[PDB]
């Protein structure tokens, strides 16, 4: 038999919220010259120049 | 120094100093505006730039 | 919000309601996401504007 005690809820969530999903979209991303590029050790990656 | 900043495109510690107004001497070498106007000088147009 | 549920169906909706994907996104979280030896290599600059 149906209730209405028994089948009464409150359900509860947030009001609202966005989600996203990529999040590196997020950074700004920029790069040095190449001819500036180092390496692990801090020294230009080609030195030849 | 302008031209490792300019080198390294890292601008964490420029931006920090200019948005806590903290003194500092950017050196390198810069045009510059030259304006003879009293108003510009009182109404402090070079602390805008 | 009140609610008119089966205890069954109550079950699945509270189980949806108590046990959600979405997490709190901020500005670390993202910045944690970059992976670490990149957020270190001086050649690349990251920001969060």
Do not use: C, W
């Not at chain 3, 909706?13 to 979280?29: A, T």
């Amino acid at each position: 038999q149906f209730d209405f005690r028994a089948s009464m809820h409150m359900l509860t969530s947030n009001l609202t919220f966005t989600v996203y999903s990529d999040l590196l979209a997020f950074v700004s991303a920029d790069t040095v010259e190449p001819i500036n590029a180092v390496a692990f050790d801090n020294m230009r990656i080609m030195n030849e120049l | 120094n302008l031209e490792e900043l300019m080198r390294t495109g890292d601008y964490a510690q420029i931006t920090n100093m200019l948005l806590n107004n903290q003194p500092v001497a950017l050196v390198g070498a810069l045009p510059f505006i030259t304006d003879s106007s009293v108003i510009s000088l009182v109404a402090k147009l070079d602390a805008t730039v | 919000y009140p609610s008119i549920l089966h205890p069954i169906d109550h079950a699945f909706n509270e189980y949806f309601l108590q046990h959600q994907l979405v997490e709190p996104l901020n500005n670390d979280i993202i910045f944690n996401y970059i992976p670490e030896r990149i957020r270190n290599d001086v050649n690349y600059i990251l920001n969060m504007d």
